């Protein structure tokens, strides 16, 4: 479903993994093999997909960790009504429960429409969180 086990010896770069309860993307991976330290160990460095914090952790080569399931969707945001974010959802209803990305980046989407630039708004679905970050 939204989260499934996987042996972290089989992970690769540019994957996804739950690091300290965060759906992070792996940017560095290494293995220390077996020797005087005791067992083969994996050193993982990951970057959060929502906030941008860096996390680091260490695996024993045989045990398992949770890989999250991410759903990719691009919604219809065409037209600004009443000054709000009138997301044209295909569910037949309209709601503003989705807020803008924190800071001035969220303002970058609405102000460019008056300049005649189209944006492919993408809403990212996580294992337990519903926030829109990815822009393309």
């Amino acid at each position: 479903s939204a989260t499934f086990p996987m042996q972290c010896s089989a992970l690769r770069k540019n994957g996804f993994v739950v690091l300290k309860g965060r759906p992070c993307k792996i940017v560095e991976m290494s293995t220390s093999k077996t020797g005087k330290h005791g067992h083969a160990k994996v050193h993982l460095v990951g970057i959060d997909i929502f906030t941008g914090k860096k996390y680091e952790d260490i695996c024993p080569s045989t045990h398992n960790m949770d890989v999250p399931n991410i759903k990719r969707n691009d919604f219809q945001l065409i037209g600004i009504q009443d000054g709000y974010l009138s997301l044209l959802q295909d569910s037949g209803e309209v709601r503003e429960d989705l807020r803008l990305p924190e800071g001035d980046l969220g303002k970058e989407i609405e102000q460019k429409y008056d300049c005649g630039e189209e944006i492919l708004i993408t809403v990212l679905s996580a294992m337990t969180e519903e926030a829109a970050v990815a822009i393309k």
Binding site: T34, G35, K36, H37, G38, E56, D57, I58
Partner: protein, 352 residues
């Protein structure tokens, strides 16, 4: 005729030596094999056998001085061990624990024959590991590329499988978890000596050196405990439970206080390195030690402290001026069991 100068140079007249001088004499086997008499001829045989005999005499003097009854305790020191007529420091390297000499040092620790122990990080790791898996015999000429592919580590001519280090980790991680917790709740300040005592308590094996060391209240000091597999395993454990602190100043106070409040001191050092200098610096506080015996294979021509002769320690006050230290240039694995068989094993029932 032959020139007079050559004859005057080759053939001079000597001066007679005092009758106090001892003649060179060996041991003849026409009288049979008497092992006690064979080992006493070493004193009058030759170059290093004489040094071995003098070492035997020095250690015997240490032992005889120790057993004299004591006439106070200065218990302000963090020590539960009483005071005797002579305090003995025993220092050794790490490669001597991986060999059979481990069974000799333990004999001295089980019977309260020494007072202070000094070693390095490997000398604890290997001693604890040997209670979980054994060590084998190899050769000096084995190639490392083929050894690594089969997961075997080499130490001199000894072989250690990789799996021996897999068990140790499994035995160590639960203990470390119990050591951080006591650091947060009970406010326990950890030092290397306390950690070594805790590990010796936990191993619970009568064949281990540190089990008897903690059972008999014999302090063990090691200034650099993070240089080895123990430090490697501590490094990986801190990723899950951070916040471990090991302090090295209280250990310095404890070891320097042992020499200051001692009636008499003696040193037995096997090898060189940090264990030799650390004990010498500890004994410098009381203006030097009274007896000293060195056994190491280093040479002095490179200016190293390991290869230093016993005469330098007199120059900077580590050994008293009116003492006669002895050094033997030999491998410890060949001369330590023979030294113990003539000094400590003979006076065995007097240590009860």
């Amino acid at each position: 005729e032959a020139p007079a100068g050559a004859l005057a140079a080759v053939l001079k007249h000597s001066s007679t030596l005092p009758p106090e001088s001892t003649q060179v004499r060996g041991y003849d086997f026409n009288r049979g094999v008497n092992y006690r008499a064979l080992l006493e001829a070493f004193g009058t045989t030759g170059f290093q056998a004489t040094n071995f005999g003098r070492a035997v005499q020095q250690v015997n003097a240490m032992i005889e001085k120790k057993l004299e009854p004591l006439s106070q305790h200065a218990d302000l020191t963090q020590s539960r061990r009483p005071l005797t007529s002579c305090t003995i420091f025993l220092g050794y390297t790490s490669n001597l624990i991986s060999s059979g000499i481990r069974e000799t040092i333990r004999y001295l620790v089980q019977h309260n024959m020494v007072d202070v122990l000094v070693t390095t990080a490997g000398g604890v790791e290997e001693d604890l590991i040997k209670c979980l898996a054994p060590t084998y015999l190899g050769e000096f000429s084995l190639r490392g590329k083929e050894l690594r592919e089969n997961g075997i580590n080499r130490i001199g001519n000894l072989l250690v499988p990789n799996e021996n280090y897999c068990k140790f980790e499994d035995w160590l991680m639960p203990i470390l978890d119990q050591m951080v917790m006591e650091q947060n709740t009970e406010g326990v300040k950890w030092t290397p000596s306390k950690m070594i005592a805790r590990l010796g308590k936990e191993i619970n094996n009568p064949e281990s050196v540190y089990y008897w060391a903690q059972k008999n209240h014999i302090p063990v000091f090691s200034p650099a405990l993070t240089d080895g597999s123990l430090g490697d395993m501590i490094f990986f454990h801190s990723y899950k439970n951070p916040g471990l602190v090991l302090d090295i100043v209280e250990d310095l106070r404890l070891i320097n206080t042992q020499a200051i409040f001692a009636k008499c001191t003696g040193m037995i050092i096997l090898g060189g390195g940090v264990v030799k200098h650390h004990i010498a610096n500890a004994n410098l506080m009381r203006n030097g030690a009274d007896y000293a015996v060195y056994i190491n294979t280093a040479q002095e021509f490179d200016g190293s402290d390991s290869g230093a002769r016993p005469d330098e320690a007199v120059s900077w006050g580590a050994i008293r001026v009116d003492a006669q230290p002895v050094k033997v240039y030999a491998d410890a694995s060949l001369v330590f069991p023979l030294l113990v068989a003539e000094t400590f094993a003979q006076k065995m029932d007097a240590f009860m």
